[PDB]
C-alpha cells in the first residue's frame, strides 16, 4: 500500500506526463520495441515500422500511445482503488491480446526510463520509487484478474 505522500509524487509526475501525452507515448513504445523486440510482434499493425523515425511518424502508433497512457493515468488517479477500470484492461489483455505479465514489466521499465529522461528534476529517488510502487501494485492486481479469467500471468 502506498503512502499519501507517495501517491502525491506519482500524481505530481503524471501531471507533467499529461502536458504531452502523445510524445511520452511514442517514446515509451519506441523504447519498449527496441529494448525487447518480441513485444512489437503482439502488434500486427506496427510490426513493419522499421525505424525510430518511422515509428514517430506513424499516427496509428501515436494514437495508440495516448490510448494506453490515458488508461494508465485513470488507474493511477484512483490511488489503488482501481477495480472498475482495471477489469476491462485485464479481460482484453488476458483473453484477447494475451500479454504476459512480463511484457507489463517491460513497459513499466520503459515508462520509468522515459519519465526520468524527460523530467529529472521532478523524478528523483523518492518519485521513482513511488511510481515504481504504483506500477508494481497495478501489475499485481492485474495478474490476479488474469487468473480469475483463466491463463496464468
Ligand atoms: C501500462 C500497460 C498497458 C496499458 C494501460 C495498455 C492499454 C491498452 C488499451 C487501453 C488498449 C485498447 C483497448 C484494449 O485493451 O483492447 C490496448 C490495446 C492493446 N494492447 Fe495494451 N496496454 C498495456 C500494455 C500492453 C503491452 C505491454 C502490450 C504488448 C505488445 C500491449 C498490447 C496491446 C494490444 C495488442 C492491443 C490491441 C491493439 C490493436 O490491435 O488495436 N499492451 N492496450
Curated annotation (Swiss-Prot):
Specify which residues bind nitrite according to the UniProt entry for this protein. Answer: 64
Sequence positions that bind heme b: 93
GO cellular component terms listed in the entry, alphabetical order: extracellular exosome; sarcoplasm
Task: Classify the main location.
Answer: cytoplasm
Identify the InterPro entries for this entry.
Globin, Globin-like_sf, Myoglobin
Name the Gene Ontology molecular function terms of this record: heme binding; metal ion binding; nitrite reductase activity; oxygen binding; oxygen carrier activity; peroxidase activity
Per UniProt, subcellular location reads as: Cytoplasm, Sarcoplasm
GO terms under biological process: removal of superoxide radicals
What region holds the Globin domain? Answer: 1-147
The catalytic activity, as recorded, is: Fe(III)-heme b-[protein] + nitric oxide + H2O = Fe(II)-heme b-[protein] + nitrite + 2 H(+); H2O2 + AH2 = A + 2 H2O
Q: Which UniProt keywords apply?
A: Cytoplasm, Heme, Iron, Metal-binding, Muscle protein, Oxidoreductase, Oxygen transport, Phosphoprotein, Transport
Query: From which domain of life does this come?
Result: Eukaryota
Which residues take part in binding O2? 64
Q: Which Pfam families match?
A: Globin (PF00042)
EC no. given is 1.7.-.-, 1.11.1.-
Phosphoserine occurs at which residues?
3
Give the protein's biological function: Monomeric heme protein which primary function is to store oxygen and facilitate its diffusion within muscle tissues. Reversibly binds oxygen through a pentacoordinated heme iron and enables its timely and efficient release as needed during periods of heightened demand. Depending on the oxidative conditions of tissues and cells, and in addition to its ability to bind oxygen, it also has a nitrite reductase activity whereby it regulates the production of bioactive nitric oxide.
Subunit-level organization? Monomeric.
Its family remark reads: Belongs to the globin family.
Q: What is this protein called?
A: Myoglobin
Gene source species? Physeter macrocephalus (Sperm whale)
